[PDB]
């Protein structure tokens, strides 16, 4: 009855938006194991952009999140069919191309982001108290 | 066999230091219920200092932390003996006066902070990439 969900990301400077996302994947089914993949420093900087925390910092934080059952850190950047078989992964969970092959196979479950709850956005708020 | 631990705080802009603290209180004994008290906006601003997030924002985040069993939000600012009886609290967990009465009663368990892992400190890091 148990379903293995896989969600990867940079998880840089984790915030309420990341957590609602992980909650969502976790509760995709009654009985799940959530595996989270944490992208590597060099690959994030190389393909995405600057990263603020190290793999170790981003990985030690995830460990405290209720919804997170297992962590793969670092995780590969691109998900392959072998990766799925190797880890017995039933669904990949991600926001919504590079995921078409997963949707063709019935193996893609979309999750949604939540605008606003971002760390960055809070520095702003700290700053209004000294608006010119 | 189960022990009720109570830890309160502002929990403003939650970081790895808050989480290791909550982990610590939670694992004070084999069988615990961790109750967390989240201080109110006006009382924090009034006694401590500026707070960045609202009670609601600080409270919705705690809800995603593995170690957190129950939340009292808002919680009173000063812990009283009645509060303990009302909630059947066995130990108050806090870093290390206003807690002497608790230590006299065997009811105070100290927890430690972790310097460095602070949000603030990370804005700094983001800023070195543009050092003059």
UniProtKB/TrEMBL annotation, chains A, B:
Residues 6-123 form the Cytidyltransferase-like domain. It comes from the Eukaryota. CMP binds at residues 10-11, 18, 95, 114. Phosphocholine binds at residues 10, 48. Signal peptide: none annotated. Belongs to the cytidylyltransferase family. It comes from Plasmodium falciparum (isolate 3D7). The chain holds residues 616 to 774 of 896 of the full protein. This is choline-phosphate cytidylyltransferase.
